[PDB]
């Protein structure tokens, strides 16, 4: 249908916003402490800590497929990016402060895309 390919549109083009917004997101951590899954193999006891992890790799394989609907879902998984990491670090280590720097640094990112979100629809 004509309906189906306009929507097919509008997915392709949020999800080129995104992936602009995660590539400003993803600058935000310049030492790459979240660009790839927490590896099990160094971490093996990882899952019983940690019940949904996040990095910004498996966000992008998601992205490629189209697999964000909206703006809230791709939030839900850069917050569990950070949440993760200040649940299993302690305050006071690099990783701990690395993701309370990346909320504050991507909350002016995620401010302005809620914005164009809504305006472009």
Same mark, same amino acid.
Not at 1 to 11: F, H, I, N, P, T
Not at 28 to 53: G, T
Not at 72 to 100: G, P, Q, S, W
């Given at each position: ?37 927490v ?6 006891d ?9 990095? /910004?790799?498996?966000?992008?394989? $998601? #992205?490629?497929? !189209? &697999?964000?609907?909206? *703006? ?6 850069? +917050? ?14 690099? /990783?701990?402060?690395?993701?309370? $720097? #990346?909320?504050? !640094? &991507?909350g002016?990112? *995620? ?6 979100? +809504?305006?472009?629809?």
């Amino acid at each position: 249908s004509m309906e189906q390919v306009a929507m097919e549109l509008r997915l392709t083009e949020l999800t080129r916003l995104l992936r602009s917004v995660l590539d400003q997101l993803q600058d935000k951590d310049p030492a790459r402490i979240f660009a790839q899954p927490v590896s099990l193999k160094e971490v093996p006891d990882y899952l019983d800590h940690i019940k949904h992890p996040m990095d /910004f790799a498996t966000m992008r394989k $998601r #992205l490629e497929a !189209q &697999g964000y609907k909206n *703006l809230h879902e791709f939030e839900e998984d850069f +917050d569990l990016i950070i949440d993760n990491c200040m649940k299993y670090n302690a305050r006071d280590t690099v /990783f701990y402060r690395a993701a309370v $720097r #990346l909320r504050d !640094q &991507g909350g002016v990112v *995620l401010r302005q895309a809620r914005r164009e979100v +809504d305006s472009i629809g």
